A paper describes a structure:
[name] [name] (henceforth called [name]) was co-crystallized with a single heptad repeat (1R) phospho-Ser5 CTD peptide and the X-ray structure was determined at 2.4 Å resolution. The [name] N-terminal WW domain (residues 10–45) forms a three stranded anti-parallel β-sheet as described for Type IV WW-domains that recognize phospho-Ser-Pro motifs, and is highly similar to those in Pin1 and CaEss1, superimposing with an RMSD of 0.7 Å. A peak of positive electron density in the WW domain near W38 and Y27 was observed that we interpret as the position of proline 6 of the heptad repeat, as observed in the Pin1-CTD structure. The entrance to the active site in [name] is formed by a large loop (aa 68–85) that includes basic residues K68, R73, R74, similar to those in Pin1 (K63, R68, R69) that interact with the phosphate group of pSer-Pro substrates. Key catalytic site residues identified in Pin1 (including H59, C113, H157, S115, Q131, F134)28,35–38 are conserved in [name] (H64, C120, H164, S122, Q138, F141) and located in analogous positions. Finally, in the [name] structure, the WW is even further removed and occupies a space on the opposite side from the PPIase domain α1-helix, generating an elongated structure.
[name] and Pin1 are small modular proteins (~19.5 kDa) composed of two compact domains; an N-terminal Type-IV WW domain22 and C-terminal catalytic (PPIase) domain. [name] isomerizes the CTD of Rpb1, facilitating the recruitment of proteins needed for efficient transcription and RNA processing. [name] has a rigid linker between its WW and catalytic domains that enforces a distance constraint for bivalent interaction with the ends of long CTD substrates (≥4–5 heptad repeats).
Residue numbers in the entry: 9 to 170
Write the structure that this text describes.
């Protein structure tokens, strides 16, 4: 909302950038369309964003689609084993710690390839992540940490930083 007609605000996966689309003219532009309620869009995107940026920690389990990370090329633990481990992991969380920061915990234990980037998945929109993951990420506020989220890849804990 805030947008005239028939404009829509969208997210460019290729550019990691918000843009504006006219479906009648098939025109796309980065700049806001003439006619817009400026701050009705801003606190529409603030409260209902079209892009978010997240960190996550992935612990895979036996019934995961891809039970083979850089840590083990065959993963044997249960779902509750992975969960209580992730729970214990999250209990260390400390933004001021060099070894217990979310980034560090990701680097220490996360089975996702993003472990080497501090669990940084970068910006993403609604056509990209697993539905279970997305529905938790977009419900989070900036700076907020999620509870345990189950997906096909494994279990996650998510931090939204953007």
């Amino acid at each position: 909302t805030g947008l005239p007609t028939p404009w829509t605000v969208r997210y460019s996966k290729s550019k990691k950038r918000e843009y504006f689309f006219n479906p009648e003219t098939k025109h796309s532009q980065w700049e806001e369309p003439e006619g817009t309620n400026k701050d009705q869009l801003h606190k529409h995107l603030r409260d209902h964003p079209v892009r978010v940026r997240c960190l996550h920690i992935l612990i895979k389990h036996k019934d995961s689609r891809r039970p083979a990370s850089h840590r083990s090329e065959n993963i044997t633990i249960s779902k509750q084993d992975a969960t209580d481990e992730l729970k214990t992991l999250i209990t260390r969380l400390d933004d001021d710690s060099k070894t217990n920061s979310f980034e560090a915990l990701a680097k220490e234990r996360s089975d996702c390839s993003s472990y080497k980037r501090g669990g940084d998945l970068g910006w993403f929109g609604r056509g990209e992540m697993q539905p279970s993951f997305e529905d938790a990420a977009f419900q989070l506020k900036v700076g907020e940490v999620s509870d345990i989220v189950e997906s096909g890849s494994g279990v996650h804990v998510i931090k939204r930083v953007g």
